[PDB]
Amino acid sequence: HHWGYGGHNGPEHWHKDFPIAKGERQSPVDIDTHTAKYDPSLKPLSVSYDQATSLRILNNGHAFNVEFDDSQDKAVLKGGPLDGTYRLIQFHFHWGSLDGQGSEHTVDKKKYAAELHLVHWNTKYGDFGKAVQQPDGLAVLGIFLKVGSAKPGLQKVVDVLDSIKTKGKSADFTNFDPRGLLPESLDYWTYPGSLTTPPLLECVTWIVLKEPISVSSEQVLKFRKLNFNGEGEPEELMVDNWRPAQPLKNRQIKASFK
Ligand SMILES: [O-][Cl+3]([O-])([O-])[O-]
Ligand SMILES: [O-][Cl+3]([O-])([O-])[O-]
Ligand SMILES: [O-][Cl+3]([O-])([O-])[O-]
Ligand SMILES: [O-]
Ligand SMILES: [Zn+2]
Structure with a gap:
């Protein structure tokens, strides 16, 4: 695989492979x-993170991933538009x-500085690799970031980036509570889509x-000091790692809120 976000290997090229x-x-x-249509039949989202077990943070050359123990229902998303447990x-x-x-979704063509994806897979499929082959396999919670006041519960993330500067580097990342990344409101839009x-x-x-979280400018500047490249290689700052909006086609976006 040789995809990335550059002019030579970025989103306009992905379709070839x-x-x-x-x-x-x-x-x-x-x-x-x-x-987007309000759908009175959509339930409240159930985000159950109390028992989450974060383990590790990894620079994968595209972004950084904060990884969780998904070997048991600890941190699960249910309800909203979903059937089943993810x-x-x-x-x-x-x-x-x-x-x-920075954001991948846009709201009336507005772009946000960043967007957080909390990736969940449907336990009916047993493993992630099986879940991605199914139309109801994943549930992805997307959260916009605007710049303003700092998000206190992000700082532990920002503080460790210095240690995973380049692709393939990882660091221990236990005892991180992802609840600290969530806005107050769980109002949401929902539609059927893909990995980005x-x-x-x-x-x-x-x-x-619907509600963005606020992060500081120092928080997001530290994201932009990461590298897409490997250690010792020509430094290519990890910036603009977003796919732009794609055609909606035959799809309905539904709102959970009037
Ligand atoms: O040089 Cl291109 O990235 O247009 O193929
Ligand atoms: O003290 Cl931290 O913000 O690194 O967790
Ligand atoms: O963040 Cl995605 O898992 O939807 O690619
Ligand atoms: O993504
Ligand atoms: Zn993503």
Whole structure:
């Protein structure tokens, strides 16, 4: 695999190795707020993170992943548009070189500085690798980041980045509480889509929170000091690791809120 975010290997190129890039259920999308329908039949999201076990943080050359023990229902997402129980596997972010870009979803064409993806897989499939092959395999909680006041519960993340600067580096990351990444409100939009990274598999129920979290400018500047490259290689700052909005096609975005 040789994909990335650069002009030579970025999203406009992905379709050659991953033809599903041009499919019917691709993510991210622009969320047109006047067209999204309130669906009174959507439940409240159930985010049950009390028993989450974070383990490790890894620079994978595209983003950094905070990984969880998904060998048991500890940290699970249920309810909302979902049937069944979905285990948290990892979260990661997408961000820009500057605060005007970075999110993958957009809201009435507005871009946020960053977007957090909490990735969960459906336990009916047993493992992540099986879940990505199924149309209801993943549930991804997306959360926008704007820049303003610092998010206190992000700082433990930002503080360790210095130690995973380059691709393949990992560090212990136990006893991180992901509840500290959530806004107050769980109001959400939902639609059927895909992973936003190759292999771009069409296996995701998207749940995108309406309320952004605020992070400081120092927090997000520290994200932009990471590297896409390996140790000792030509430094390529890990910035603009976002896929742009894709066609909505034959899809309905639903709102949980009037
Ligand atoms: O040089 Cl391109 O990235 O247009 O193929
Ligand atoms: O003290 Cl920290 O913000 O690194 O957890
Ligand atoms: O964050 Cl994704 O898992 O939907 O690629
Ligand atoms: O992603
Ligand atoms: Zn993502």
